[PDB]
Amino acid sequence: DQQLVDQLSQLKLNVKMLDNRAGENGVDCAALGADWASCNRVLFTLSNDGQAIDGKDWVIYFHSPRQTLRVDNDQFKIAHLTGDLYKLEPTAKFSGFPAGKAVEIPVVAEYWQLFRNDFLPRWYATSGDAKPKMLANTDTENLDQFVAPFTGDQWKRTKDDKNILMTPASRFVSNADLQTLPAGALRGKIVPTPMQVKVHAQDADLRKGVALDLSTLVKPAADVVSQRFALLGVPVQTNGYPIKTDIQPGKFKGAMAVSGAYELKIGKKEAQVIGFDQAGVFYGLQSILSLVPSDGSGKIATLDASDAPRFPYRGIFLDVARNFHKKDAVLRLLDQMAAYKLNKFHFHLSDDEGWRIEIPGLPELTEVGGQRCHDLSETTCLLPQYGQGPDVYGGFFSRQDYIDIIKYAQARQIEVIPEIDMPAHARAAVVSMEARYKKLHAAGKEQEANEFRLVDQTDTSNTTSVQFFNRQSYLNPCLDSSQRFVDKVIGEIAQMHKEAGQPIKTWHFGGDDAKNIRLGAGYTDKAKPEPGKGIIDQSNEDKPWAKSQVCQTMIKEGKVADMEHLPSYFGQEVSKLVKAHGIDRMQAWQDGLKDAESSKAFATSRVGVNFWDTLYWGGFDSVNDWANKGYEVVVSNPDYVYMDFPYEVNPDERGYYWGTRFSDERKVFSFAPDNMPQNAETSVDRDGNHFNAKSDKPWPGAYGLSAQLWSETQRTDPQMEYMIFPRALSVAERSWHRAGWEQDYRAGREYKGGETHFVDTQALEKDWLRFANILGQRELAKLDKGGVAYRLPVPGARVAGGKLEANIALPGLGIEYSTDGGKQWQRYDAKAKPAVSGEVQVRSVSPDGKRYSRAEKV
Amino acid sequence: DQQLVDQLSQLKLNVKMLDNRAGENGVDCAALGADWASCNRVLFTLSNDGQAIDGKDWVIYFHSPRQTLRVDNDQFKIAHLTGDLYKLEPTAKFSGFPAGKAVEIPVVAEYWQLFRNDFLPRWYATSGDAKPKMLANTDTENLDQFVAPFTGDQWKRTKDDKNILMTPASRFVSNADLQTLPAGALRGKIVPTPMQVKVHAQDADLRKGVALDLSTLVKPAADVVSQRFALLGVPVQTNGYPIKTDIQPGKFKGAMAVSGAYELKIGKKEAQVIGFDQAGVFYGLQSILSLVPSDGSGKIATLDASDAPRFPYRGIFLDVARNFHKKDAVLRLLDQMAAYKLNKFHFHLSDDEGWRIEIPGLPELTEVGGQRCHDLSETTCLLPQYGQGPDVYGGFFSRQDYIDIIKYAQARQIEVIPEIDMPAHARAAVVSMEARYKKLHAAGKEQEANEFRLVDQTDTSNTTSVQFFNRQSYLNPCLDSSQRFVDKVIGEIAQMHKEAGQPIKTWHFGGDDAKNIRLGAGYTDKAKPEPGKGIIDQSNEDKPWAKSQVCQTMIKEGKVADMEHLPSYFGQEVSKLVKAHGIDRMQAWQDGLKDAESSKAFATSRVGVNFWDTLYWGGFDSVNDWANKGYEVVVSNPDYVYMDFPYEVNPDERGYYWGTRFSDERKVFSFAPDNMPQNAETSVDRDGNHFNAKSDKPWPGAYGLSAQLWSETQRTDPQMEYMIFPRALSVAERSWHRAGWEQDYRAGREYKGGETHFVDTQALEKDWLRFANILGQRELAKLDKGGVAYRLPVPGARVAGGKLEANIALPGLGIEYSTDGGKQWQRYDAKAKPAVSGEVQVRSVSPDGKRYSRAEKV
Numbered sequence A, B: 001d002q003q004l005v006d007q008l009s010q011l012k013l014n015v016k017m018l019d020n021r022a023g024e025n026g027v028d029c030a031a032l033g034a035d036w037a038s039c040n041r042v043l044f045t046l047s048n049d050g051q052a053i054d055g056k057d058w059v060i061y062f063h064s065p066r067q068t069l070r071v072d073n074d075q076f077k078i079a080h081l082t083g084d085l086y087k088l089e090p091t092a093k094f095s096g097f098p099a100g101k102a103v104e105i106p107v108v109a110e111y112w113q114l115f116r117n118d119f120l121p122r123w124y125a126t127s128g129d130a131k132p133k134m135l136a137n138t139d140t141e142n143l144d145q146f147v148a149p150f151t152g153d154q155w156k157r158t159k160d161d162k163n164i165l166m167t168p169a170s171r172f173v174s175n176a177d178l179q180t181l182p183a184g185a186l187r188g189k190i191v192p193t194p195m196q197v198k199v200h201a202q203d204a205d206l207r208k209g210v211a212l213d214l215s216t217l218v219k220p221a222a223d224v225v226s227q228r229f230a231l232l233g234v235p236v237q238t239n240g241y242p243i244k245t246d247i248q249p250g251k252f253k254g255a256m257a258v259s260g261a262y263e264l265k266i267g268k269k270e271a272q273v274i275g276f277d278q279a280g281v282f283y284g285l286q287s288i289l290s291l292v293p294s295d296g297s298g299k300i301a302t303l304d305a306s307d308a309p310r311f312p313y314r315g316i317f318l319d320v321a322r323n324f325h326k327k328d329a330v331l332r333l334l335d336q337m338a339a340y341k342l343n344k345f346h347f348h349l350s351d352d353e354g355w356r357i358e359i360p361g362l363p364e365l366t367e368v369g370g371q372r373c374h375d376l377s378e379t380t381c382l383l384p385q386y387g388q389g390p391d392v393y394g395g396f397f398s399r400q401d402y403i404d405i406i407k408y409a410q411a412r413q414i415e416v417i418p419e420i421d422m423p424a425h426a427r428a429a430v431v432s433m434e435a436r437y438k439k440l441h442a443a444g445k446e447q448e449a450n451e452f453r454l455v456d457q458t459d460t461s462n463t464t465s466v467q468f469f470n471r472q473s474y475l476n477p478c479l480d481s482s483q484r485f486v487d488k489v490i491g492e493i494a495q496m497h498k499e500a501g502q503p504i505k506t507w508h509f510g511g512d513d514a515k516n517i518r519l520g521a522g523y524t525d526k527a528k529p530e531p532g533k534g535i536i537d538q539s540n541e542d543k544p545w546a547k548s549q550v551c552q553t554m555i556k557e558g559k560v561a562d563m564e565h566l567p568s569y570f571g572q573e574v575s576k577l578v579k580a581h582g583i584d585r586m587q588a589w590q591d592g593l594k595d596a597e598s599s600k601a602f603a604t605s606r607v608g609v610n611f612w613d614t615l616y617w618g619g620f621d622s623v624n625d626w627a628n629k630g631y632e633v634v635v636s637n638p639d640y641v642y643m644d645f646p647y648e649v650n651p652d653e654r655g656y657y658w659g660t661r662f663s664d665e666r667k668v669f670s671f672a673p674d675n676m677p678q679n680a681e682t683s684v685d686r687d688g689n690h691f692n693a694k695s696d697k698p699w700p701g702a703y704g705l706s707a708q709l710w711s712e713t714q715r716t717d718p719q720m721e722y723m724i725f726p727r728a729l730s731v732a733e734r735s736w737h738r739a740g741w742e743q744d745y746r747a748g749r750e751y752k753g754g755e756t757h758f759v760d761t762q763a764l765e766k767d768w769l770r771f772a773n774i775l776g777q778r779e780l781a782k783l784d785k786g787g788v789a790y791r792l793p794v795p796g797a798r799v800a801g802g803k804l805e806a807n808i809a810l811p812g813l814g815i816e817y818s819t820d821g822g823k824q825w826q827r828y829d830a831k832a833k834p835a836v837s838g839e840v841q842v843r844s845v846s847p848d849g850k851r852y853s854r855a856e857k858v
């Protein structure tokens, strides 16, 4: 009853890692079904400072990105509902949570949990009809309230892991090749780096303001330029320093003859920007603005520059489905996209755990799919996921919100590409359409109920998704109604785009992970188990839709070859719907189209692919085929440009880490997207080891680059902003500019990590040093002004001769230190280092002085 | 002597633009007499690869549409004879064209020359009685032989010109909102668009042939239908698919109750066409034929349609006076008129430079007026014009030819409207009648000599025509003999029409530009010159006929009010002659009638006007009056439907460009002729700027639409066909069908270019996309079959990721590309784009594979 739920809610949880390599130590992970026989032991402690809790009628729900495989306290048992949701219950031996006691519930989980962020907040209790309530100490974003600190080598994935744990002492080393450059060395350095520039000795003085000739721009775009001059402190006045603009495509030749190219002249008393188009004009103005200094001095260098994108497509992907992010945070994201010349906003509007766009005619998508709450019938919500609590969680963009966002992107030369992921990652839609079927069906409106249904009523398929949902994650690709559903959604979102003044140019089909993970190579069958693999029963495991009779007659009449091809078939069918709606480009996660013959198989004359294999796994050689078969390769490698991954190897950092252990500003910047093999000389793999890479195939070139912010653990908007900024500026640099150290692709060249020296690493490091200093001494101050909660790097620090030496990944940032356990903080000065003894803590501070990095002991 | 003329003939000419905005740069265009003080500098280079040419007894003649104002090599001087003819001579300082030298003769010309086609071929030399010979390298239609390529921004008219120069890179952008539609989306789409249609899923199969019931048509018209089925590949056989026809006016109601309306049913095994009249029947059959696919498949969609003209009058105007065009090209023009349902052929049979119809009783009109040759007495020819060479150039339709043409038009439901332009644009007639006067006078037959004379022997008027002729361009409107002349010509052409089975319904009086251009606002007087205008002597400038004593006593007895009214007076007098000949409709260029009170002033019960002001100059508001005064407005705006204007802004395109810089297929299609103000939201003005338009007056409606092919630079028949086709299909569409995006006229509505969004531009663009694809994938192949040398658009192209992307203004057309400087060409494939590096050239190819667009570098 409620009293029992109230008691449970007052238990205090403690989660503590016990062994991240249990399989290296005596646990038979394989016998427990663990993938590749890897499992970890963790201790859940429930402390009860109240009277005894002896009732038995209860369930405690909790979330985890890892499956629980065993429970080592025979008073309790754990089972899975679906996705990340698990329930903890009392067994027949349960004898209560004793008054004033701590109950220990050790468990084994699949894989490893190397970051404290793996442990999700908001555990909650239930009991017969009572209302659910969270375990209070878990209702927080501060992991310290319920997750113990990692100790020793708990961060290691395996005994041979060569990653380097970042602490002030090792971080100091990681940062020691850097230094702070004098203002005099950072004159006339536009970001992103322009193709050709010549800086002269004088400076244009803007502090009295500028007279902007913006007749080349449509009003909304001009206002964006005017309002940015003001944000950076430069008045706009008719008697100010002249900045002229003109559009003359012909002035441009060859590779410069493309959207966004411009010529820019900065003189002593006037400015000139000649663009290839409005985008070029806008971008030229952005370059002038990138020069505006953070000191308010309003002085910029005179210079002569010529510039154009190395790629058409310079994108940022944002997941709002896993955890919603508000309109104001999308807008702050676009404002920064425009300032650094990104032009593509890939909007992941749906996935298993949420549907975020209102669709006229399909209200259930948002009424049910837009919120998650504790309802086991999933008639009014999706089941809770991601540690947001049992009560309603969600939101969605209304038609007007969405239209506003597109208008807002258009003003900033940013194209919005909507993604409605299918045929997997579609649980929100499938469950919403099931609620719709039922409602309509209950009124006897059987044709209306079936109109947009995404399930085949005979489908008993047993399939497990990558995030542990079941068949409800997969929209059936063989139903006419599924096609009716996709056609209606495309038609509705297409109209919103038209109303917003930016008709859709690319429809993103999604298409990732449409497979049963239990059929994977790291799992084996109970009957004849092979070694080192998770032992499961594969007798009743099936590919997706195997048991859909509709998908059977589909394959019989010969429309499709086999169950295996359903996903590409569906990608081709959607391309027809996309084309039927007047859109001539489709894009997808490359694995959904991997069974098509080539791009010739699609109805749109252009098919792009977000290439997301990792390099160390053959991605530097498998990407070639994608281009060679006619697809436009948007490079999206998870080992470099997945912004949901950690900035550094430290158990207190936020981020998933399946494709690599970290990707900081420097690593992103050092990625060479158009000569993938070369990354073997400039980066290490997921376990910190050197790797080799070589391809012998033709490589015509990439079409673009895209950095992704998946949102599983980015539960809030500030957390989203921390993960995107400031490493997105690196993305922007690399998406716009081809550096000199980025070598031409050479078939047959074999780059061997720690062995070959083909890459001009000296040039790479000098380039990075300058970029890092531009961020520290000028751009981060602009981020402060845009209000985005970017991550401030923790300082590196060492004590020599009894004096603090500190450094930072983005030279120019202020560094503070404390000699009192963080009670009083003081400004560290390089040329007058302080004397310390005992425990010293260090932290960095934003340029406007309001925010601090986390604090760490030296 | 001949040797000198032979030497000159071997000089090689080079013409190269030096500055198209000389007045913006230091030249005092106003001081040189340039209109609105605008002038340009051009370099004429004469290279001599032979021995020295030192004789002085020579003249070199050349043509230009611009007047030469200054000569910057003091060895030479240039003067005007009349019209476009100029002579280049040696001055007293001439010292010969040195052996193996290039002589440079820089000159200043009035206005600007933005297209290489402005420079005319066929310069020629003369010397005492020797025979004239051309400068050989100029004897060609290939401008590259003597006209240098334009460079930089030489295409700009003024420093602020906002037109967009079309190159493969910018053209790619202009074309990027388009795409190719699958055959499945182009089923049952008749062109022009029918008023009401419903297409069903099956297709009628005609590949075995059709059984045509054509008893509703007079034989000549039925043969036209039969022969078109065969041209398109569909056999005609008694056992073929039935196509029935019937004529029942009553089945039609309201707006459908008009000539050319029809009901059409296309079923699985039979066809039905019910017309309001023979024209409707014929048109219904044309719609079935428009559906016949270019692949020979003979499959058309079943459908049910109802259709009628939005306007009675759907015309095509053709100038054969400036440059003649043969009977076979008129016939190919009519065949296409019929296929797209145009029913009016406005035939400009005369003008200053040629008279093209044999008139019994007036042989000189064709013996002298039908040819141009170098004869300074103009006793056997008119003076050479338009770069056709010094030797005889011309031709004319014999009475039988002309009768044939009318019979041919009648068979195709096309009405021939003859125009004999007057009182200006009549030099051919005036000079021919002067030769007649003289001949007859020499035999002493003084009454015969004066019978049809068009000059008053006392007339010393000094007037300059728009094309720079003098008083001989103006027929005297005050002479009884001029009226005898017009009466005889009407009587003779009227009889030819009767003999051909199509009695004249409209007589076109012409009436354009009857004024002295030196009295214009852009010129000023030497005594007190105002700024920015061409400074000339206006003391002895007079209106036309001011100095004709006959026109003085005419004005005295009070028959006419003043010199200024002579032109409308003449329009009224001709209307009486037209009516006296049994014709009850007169038509004219609206400016000749602008001084009549209203239509009440004419003798015919109907008076039409070809309205030819431009919109950006108040035409969207001045047209109202024309309708409001009783005139039938035939919309003919030069800013949209003058087919002598360029298809695109590119110095290598053919076309005059006074009213606008370009009018491509898309622009013509987008013109809204019955709500003129709306064009301000859908087009830009002559300098590429937005414009506004609004009227507050009553607008009852237009009577029809007409697209004009003036022929100054259409020297050959293939050039005529290039300029008319394929944009005439757009004209046809807009003349027949009122689109949904064509809004009702709203008094007081103010459309503001780039500011108001009243027009459903999305609907406009979708309509155009479909139309463009019908042309690319089906209709252009039919043009190939009719043998008309239509213009093939140059592809747009860009290189991304090192691969060619190409598009085209008429999707469906094949695109080729070369990576060897145009030596080897290969087929471009959208879904398997090619990899290129270096110079790439692109070109399009007709559907039958025999012809190519020009080639351009990417």
Ligand SMILES: CC(=O)N[C@@H]1[C@@H](O)[C@H](O[C@@H]2O[C@H](CO)[C@@H](O)[C@H](O)[C@H]2NC(C)=O)[C@@H](CO)O[C@H]1O
Residues within 6 Å of the ligand: A065, A066, A466, A512, A513, A589, A612, A642, A644, A656, A657, A658, A710, A711, A712
């Ligand atoms: C807990 C964990 O790390 N699971 C991995 C999945 O997150 C991962 O999925 C892909 O990566 C994103 C997160 O970085 C997911 O949000 C996204 O849905 C998914 N798809 C793409 C295109 O990235 C998979 C990939 O194999 O690995 C799991 O192990």
Ligand SMILES: CC(=O)N[C@@H]1[C@@H](O)[C@H](O[C@@H]2O[C@H](CO)[C@@H](O)[C@H](O)[C@H]2NC(C)=O)[C@@H](CO)O[C@H]1O
Residues within 6 Å of the ligand: B065, B066, B466, B512, B513, B589, B612, B642, B644, B656, B657, B658, B710, B711, B712
């Ligand atoms: C060289 C030039 O562009 N001159 C213009 C004349 O061509 C033009 O005349 C009118 O336009 C037609 C050509 O497009 C002429 O062939 C036709 O005789 C004449 N009349 C009509 C009814 O169009 C005049 C118009 O003002 O402008 C000159 O500037």
